[PDB]
Amino acid sequence: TQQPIVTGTSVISMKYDNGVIIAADNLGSYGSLLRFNGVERLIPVGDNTVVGISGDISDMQHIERLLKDLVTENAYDNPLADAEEALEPSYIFEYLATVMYQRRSKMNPLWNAIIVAGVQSNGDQFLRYVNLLGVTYSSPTLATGFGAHMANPLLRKVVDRESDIPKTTVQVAEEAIVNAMRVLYYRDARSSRNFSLAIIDKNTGLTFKKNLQVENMKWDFAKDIKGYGTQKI
């Protein structure tokens, strides 16, 4: 891909005491046109990993196909594919990251930003980031695009350091994620009110919620805004 066409916007994610949470809207934008509504950008792999992708929707679907093929190939000749030899989040990440860096170095990158979030077999919370440049980093809060500028400042006030992770509950993290989605719908032109939210908890497993909407919006004060300065009526 040399320039993206149909693109998805920000993807936010953060850790908490017993797992991780990720979320992203369901919008596919043809530039300035909100062309496709209801476009799932959260790909659940197994019962312990979720991949959130932003960028070219075609490359996102290519990565979906790659993940499905990776699951199928790991199932081959593996009697423990549902157990000790299942696909871990770190495996899926490392694979995607190798792919992204290779595609960058071949001057034909996957125009995407990917966030892999899940729980390892030993209960550890995995949350890492990659992009079309192949740059990888891991932080208690990860966002792409406008989220990286707006979602992270809100989510980092809950977990500014690793030591804050054991103190955060699932309700706190989910409320923060919903607030960040609302703020993005406020201040992102390429955003949507409908989104999806996944919770990978080391005890309850994968909880995937679709068709969510941004609620509790403050718009009443818009009635008191009249004119761009000196106008009174």
Next chain:
Amino acid sequence: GTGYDLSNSVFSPDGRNFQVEYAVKAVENGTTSIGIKCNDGVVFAVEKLITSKLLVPQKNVKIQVVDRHIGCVYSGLIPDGRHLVNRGREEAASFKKLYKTPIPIPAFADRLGQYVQAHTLYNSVRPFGVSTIFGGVDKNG
């Protein structure tokens, strides 16, 4: 004349490829494996000869899986069966990548059959030493 069994793909005066029949003899020397088609699917079964108690039970899996819906069990030379299963998995992956839908069971059958028939076409390749019972459930049952 003589020597019609020394080279693969060479037809005998009767019209037979003796190397193929020798491979069949090699197949008959293997353990027993069966397949039964029920009303909504298929069931495969295989015997694993326990050469010694040193073998780990429930390990040394003999039945292989292709895609997520095809099962294959082969009687004869186990390495040849694994090679054929790998080739079939490649064919199924190609079929899915190109047509989205999972490969139909008859299409997979024809792919494996053309692969084997090609392996019985040249004197530089040895015919497969396995008989394979496979199948599964597709959109046509």
